[PDB]
Symmetry: C2
Subunit: 256 residues, 2 copies
């Protein structure tokens, strides 16, 4: 079967992270959309204009709004993109055939929206040469970050080739987790986000979303299906592109 | 010898085009700066804010201004980046050890600044699925363009791999040649631009800067040295990365 995959990058990244996966999925016959979220990639906004994870998600929500009735998509989110998935599913659940989490945060419906982010920060507290700043938007102080190049090299892009790491140095931008805004946000709903099919893809060789964290997430909120990819790194769409495409094909053949 | 190379992308592109070449040059021991010009790559400006090729060049001029006395660089410009080189050399000639033209426009000092652009448009008049628009800035109507995906695939990225073409689809932005603004600009100066050493690198397999055009440029304004790279495509920094690095090493060993 063919599907329409919507690929969702993490904070400080953009659609460009999907540049290997997108053509491979198209060579299987799928439709693929790879979005820039607000203030990401080549989106014209700067992060200081953005006040919440929900505002950050606007390009995904606008895209979903534009789907004609009856058209469903498979969302694929890397790293913090699982939060974009949960936000999207609470507005457009009927348009989502399934969600695939790709070394991603896996929010739940029983705890506040920041819950898995709070946990991540306990498991991985030292972001190396990452820099931080604060800005104010909608009367709240937001912590912005710019991912450190050593962190990128050692922990996110560990096994990626030098030309891929170079792209990350060139293209990663200031972003935010909006952690304190998530902490005050209404919970993700059981009827919306809770109802979608959830496929969790990971590697135990991820050097930032460590096995303790990922296995904690799986136990916390049981996925419909789990795929463990052997080897690679945090950026499986770069280091294990073919394996990710094969998994996504199986998801397309399972959920519609 | 080691040099400091400053890599200068073409219109509608960004530093990302250099993502393969930059690490290779660093693996030879060089310093490398790959800039985003105004309204390019992840620069925060949109093209409609930019009124001339000189304003477009601001990040290159600001970078050169920031070099301490005595530090020289080798400029490397692809495609329309030769115009950025000429602009830069008329402000900071003393900071430029040499300029390398990489399937690039080669402006001169005897004709107005638009001269080689005007010629290019005669040799290659049909930009396929490229779209055009107009905006007004500083009381002049400027023609903007967005490079067509078929043009990108067939003429710029002809032999590049699908993952490279994907990056171009994702990251190329609206830009402008500022052709009518160039036509009215004061000529490039003999003392400044005319005095720098100029190395012309090309392939006769370029499907946009065709051999008639490139050989016309070489005859029009004799380079100090010409290197012809066999094979590849317009994006030699993607298809012939190693060959380009070897040429640049020789330039670093010749001009300081």
């Amino acid at each position: 079967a063919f599907a329409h995959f919507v690929l969702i990058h993490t904070i400080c990244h953009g659609a460009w992270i999907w540049h290997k996966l997108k053509p491979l999925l198209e060579a299987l016959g799928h439709k693929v959309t790879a979005l820039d979220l607000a203030a990401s990639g080549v989106d014209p906004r700067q992060i200081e204009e953005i006040g919440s994870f929900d505002e950050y998600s606007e390009p995904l929500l606008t895209f979903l709004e534009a789907l004609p009735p009856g058209e469903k998509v498979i969302l694929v989110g890397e790293s913090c993109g699982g939060l974009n998935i949960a936000i999207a599913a609470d507005k457009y659940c009927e348009k989502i055939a399934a969600a695939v989490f790709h070394n991603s945060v896996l929010p739940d419906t029983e705890h506040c929206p920041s819950y898995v982010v709070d946990k991540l920060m306990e498991v991985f507290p030292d972001w190396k040469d990452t820099t931080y700043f604060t800005y104010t938007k909608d009367g709240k102080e937001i912590t912005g970050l710019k991912l450190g190049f050593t962190l990128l090299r050692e922990n996110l892009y560990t096994l990626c080739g030098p030309e891929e790491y170079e792209l990350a140095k060139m293209l990663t931008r200031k972003g935010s987790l909006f952690q304190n805004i998530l902490a005050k946000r209404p919970f993700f709903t059981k009827e919306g986000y809770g109802s979608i099919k959830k496929i969790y893809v990971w590697t135990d060789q991820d050097e930032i979303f460590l096995p303790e964290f990922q296995l904690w997430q799986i136990e916390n909120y049981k996925p419909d299906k789990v795929y463990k990819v052997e080897g690679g790194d945090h950026k499986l769409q770069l280091t294990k592109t073919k394996e990710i495409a094969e998994i996504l094909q199986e998801v397309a053949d399972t959920y519609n």
